[PDB]
Amino acid sequence: PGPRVVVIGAGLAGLAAAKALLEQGFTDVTVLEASSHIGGRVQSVKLGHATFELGATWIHGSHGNPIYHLAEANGLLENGVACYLTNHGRRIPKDVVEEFSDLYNEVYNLTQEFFVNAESQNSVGVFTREEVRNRIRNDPDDPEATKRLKLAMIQQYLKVESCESSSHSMDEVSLSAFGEWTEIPGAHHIIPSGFMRVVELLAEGIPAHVIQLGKPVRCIHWDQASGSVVVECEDCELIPADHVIVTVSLGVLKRQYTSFFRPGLPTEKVAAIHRLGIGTTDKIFLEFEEPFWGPECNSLQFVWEDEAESHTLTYPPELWYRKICGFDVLYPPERYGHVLSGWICGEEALVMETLSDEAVAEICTEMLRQFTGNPNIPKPRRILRSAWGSNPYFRGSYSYTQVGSSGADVEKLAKPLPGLQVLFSGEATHRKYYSTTHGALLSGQREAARLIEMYRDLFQQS
Amino acid sequence: PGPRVVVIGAGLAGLAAAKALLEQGFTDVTVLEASSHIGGRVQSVKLGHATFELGATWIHGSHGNPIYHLAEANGLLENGVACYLTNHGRRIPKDVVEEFSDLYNEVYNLTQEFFVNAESQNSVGVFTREEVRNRIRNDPDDPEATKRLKLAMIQQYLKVESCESSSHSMDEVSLSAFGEWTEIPGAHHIIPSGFMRVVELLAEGIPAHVIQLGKPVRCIHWDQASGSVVVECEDCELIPADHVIVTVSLGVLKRQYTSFFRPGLPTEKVAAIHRLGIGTTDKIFLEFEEPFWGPECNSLQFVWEDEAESHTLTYPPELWYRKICGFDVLYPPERYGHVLSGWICGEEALVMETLSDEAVAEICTEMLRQFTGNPNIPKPRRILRSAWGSNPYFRGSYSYTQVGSSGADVEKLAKPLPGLQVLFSGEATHRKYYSTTHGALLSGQREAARLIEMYRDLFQQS
Ligand SMILES: C=C=CCNCCCC/N=C/C=C(\C)N1c2cc(C)c(C)cc2N(C[C@H](O)[C@H](O)[C@H](O)COP(=O)(O)OP(=O)(O)OC[C@H]2O[C@@H](n3cnc4c(N)ncnc43)[C@H](O)[C@@H]2O)c2[nH]c(=O)[nH]c(=O)c21
Ligand SMILES: C=C=CCNCCCC/N=C/C=C(\C)N1c2cc(C)c(C)cc2N(C[C@H](O)[C@H](O)[C@H](O)COP(=O)(O)OP(=O)(O)OC[C@H]2O[C@@H](n3cnc4c(N)ncnc43)[C@H](O)[C@@H]2O)c2[nH]c(=O)[nH]c(=O)c21
Ligand SMILES: Oc1ccc(Nc2nc(-c3cnc4ccccn34)cs2)cc1
Ligand SMILES: Oc1ccc(Nc2nc(-c3cnc4ccccn34)cs2)cc1
Ligand SMILES: [Cl-]
Ligand SMILES: [Cl-]
């Protein structure tokens, strides 16, 4: 028949791998997808004539980005100030916000010269914040009331950083000569029609029989003495294979590696799985009848005055809501309506995922009332939100550079099992583009290219 | 190697099968048992120097019973009146109980002449009760107060019958010339040391490596084009086999047959699985500090005066307790202490299994107070009870003759799949001894004898 290839997962990596193989005339290819849908951590949701992204939101980069090339080639591409509010209703002055912002940028840049690896990243933030904290307290020409606001903004800024995959994702943005945090102009693009359109363009080539939806794998049996690999599905089907490409998230690997592989994985790969970090990042959309936020406001930034002294990382499960750093006003209102877009990251995101919509909605409304100083804000007409952490096909949003891991661990995760029987793909297997759509895509093409090369050589031999 | 034989389950049928094969020099035998223990629906529990049975309690029969032969050969074998109480505390007179008992026995025997199959069984009870109900109401020489008691005892007697596997299990007992329900003398024997001792005597022959405890099967793959059978365990191990003997309960088959077999079972077997009935029967033990029941009382029989008109079968989930027909006083007190032994059968048993011990205990204590007329009865020191229905390795206590099934369905369940690739054992596969320990044992020996015969012939051929 030619090589039997099972691709596990139909996110960007799985589809990229399958397309690349089929493009090379690989006849005997099957994709097994656990969920009812393709796209994985690309999940687009339509409400009215407007799309909301629950997963991947922006295309990072331009020329060279193969997902930018897709979006651009099929024509899928194309205000105010941020409003800092205290938990006692009062708004923080332009001056105070600008002063803090300037101090932080000065210290963060001076510090990043001082200290490019995963452990050394952490040190920048830790010592930045200590140095910023010292200068605020030490500044003799500041009233004590204002010092307590600025010190609380350290905790606010820390919540903003929490959602980032690296320091390098936070090295895109720099501070403007007029106190605003300006991103590089052509860096981040949205797809108004939805990010799923890219998934569908990628899947277009692939025949319909290849992709098996609602078909999760239970175990990969490799090193067999017919196919020397056997894929065991949850519905108990035994699929013989020559090669397998695993694209499931690092979070799936962390929870299932002991059962998922027979025999067990080599111990350096198991160590890599443990050492590498995957974070839970969820999106919360709050659609209101009309805007209670001022027209100058791009966003509503939450500075809790009682967090001046805290060096907190994780909140208790009652204070999960305190992990939200603020809400962005979606523009334009005509496309999206009056919708606030929020992010929550880490253990507090898993706590949010357990709550019902009416509960999450209520707590966000309570927050917004307290911060705005208007207690009359109605409950939002609609709410939309993700649950990547508790979903057993994801168990996380994206891989990040954890203190006590390295680029060495990604190479170890990405390394194939002997005879290329089992190949490792997915965002977390990409050395430099991990936690992105293009990393996911390129990782799929890498493992495909590996089998492609193996059988160009068995044509060049034979 | 000689034939690879996987036996699924290490209850009486699985052990009987494995022993019989090994006795015949079958080298390559494995038993896979889901639970941590052997014995299955034989489960013995020690408290003090005394054993309580949660499953199989009595050896039914003597000479010819191969479980009697075991018990007898290893030397493991060797009061008052039943007290009928109303839910308003008052005790029902000797006369009233004897009169009812005589009427019922007369009608039940006259009726059983009128109508030996599974559907025709049901008709006996239905018309017995209607005829008994008529004569009570019709009797001109009875006060109305007494008629309402006797009519409630129909519902009581119906609860007693509910726990029986057949009419033939209720054809052992007959009525004495002095109004008592007398069992045949040498019919039922207990094992004071515990029923598990029989399980252990049966397992004695078998080497330790053969039985894999804590090892449930997920799927049997048969009809494979190495072993033409593959047993798929829950921990994802693939065990190649030539023959498999399935001994799991009818309840396990009802819930799992669609996933458990690949390809699917022949449709007459699937029909047999649906047609055959398995009931949930649980035991409740209530150990008290001292006896509040009178010394004349073998048992405390519960007659609810408000059930005179009802033709109930299933109670709602709040009235689950009403399915208990009474409690037996265990004899002798020196062995067991002051322990009441109760039975609950059907859907109401599953409702009991969901409740906590403190809850079940409380409701039984409440019942006992109301019926005795003593509200001062303390909460029992200990409680012990079974959960056969909710246990996923049982999902029932024993197979019964359901209206709309026949002996034909048992033959259909018991029939092996082609090439004797998969063999069907267990109590519910025995034509006449279903719902017994000896039926279970003999069913195991039958499937063993089948493979034994197959390979005496492949020795006589070769
Ligand atoms: C002013 C002001 C302030 C504004 N601040 C701006 C800061 C913004 C910084 N950028 C942030 C971007 C985020 C957060 N973005 C973001 C947000 C959020 C909420 C998420 C969740 C992610 C992202 N990323 C990451 C990507 O989405 C992710 O890497 C890829 O989709 C993964 O593809 P894959 O490897 O194939 O895995 P998959 O999991 O997709 O596929 C594997 C499949 O396997 C299946 N499966 C599982 N188990 C199985 C089994 N047992 N058997 C069979 N199948 C099985 C499973 O169902 C899947 O379909 C982003 N990327 C990007 O490019 N742009 C972005 O903006 C974001
Ligand atoms: C005065 C006055 C009034 C007094 N009234 C007197 C009336 C009394 C009438 N007699 C009543 C008797 C009862 C109720 N008795 C009674 C009471 C109660 C509460 C019960 C629960 C039963 C009974 N019976 C029935 C037997 O116990 C039963 O038939 C056998 O144990 C079954 O053996 P097996 O077929 O091998 O199955 P198993 O299930 O045991 O074995 C299969 C194994 O498979 C395992 N398994 C499941 N799934 C698996 C997977 N996926 N992979 C691997 N393994 C898996 C599983 O864990 C098991 O170990 C009795 N029999 C008897 O002889 N005397 C009796 O007294 C009673
Ligand atoms: O694409 C972006 C990203 C961020 C922002 N805006 C804000 N950034 C920060 C912030 C926190 N920590 C640091 C460290 C370095 C630089 C910025 N920051 C606070 S608000 C706008 C556009
Ligand atoms: O091994 C036994 C079984 C039962 C009893 N005692 C009682 N049996 C009945 C009863 C109900 N229905 C019928 C129909 C026919 C015969 C009896 N019964 C009520 S109390 C004692 C020993
Ligand atoms: Cl969006
Ligand atoms: Cl007992």
Author numbering:
A (entry chain A), B (entry chain A): 3 to 80, 98 to 134, 140 to 249, 254 to 490
Give excerpts from the publication.
The second pathway involves a one-step reaction where Spm is directly oxidized by hSMOX to produce Spd, H2O2 and 3-AP.
The co-crystal structure of hSMOX with JNJ-1289 was determined at 2.1 Å resolution, revealing that JNJ-1289 binds to an allosteric site, providing JNJ-1289 with a high degree of selectivity towards hSMOX. JNJ-1289 binds ehSMOX in an allosteric pocket ~13 Å from the FAD isoalloxazine ring. The JNJ-1289 phenol oxygen is involved in a H-bond with the carboxylic acid of Glu207. As observed in the JNJ-1289-ehSMOX co-crystal structure, the compound-induced conformation of aa190–210 closes off the putative active site.
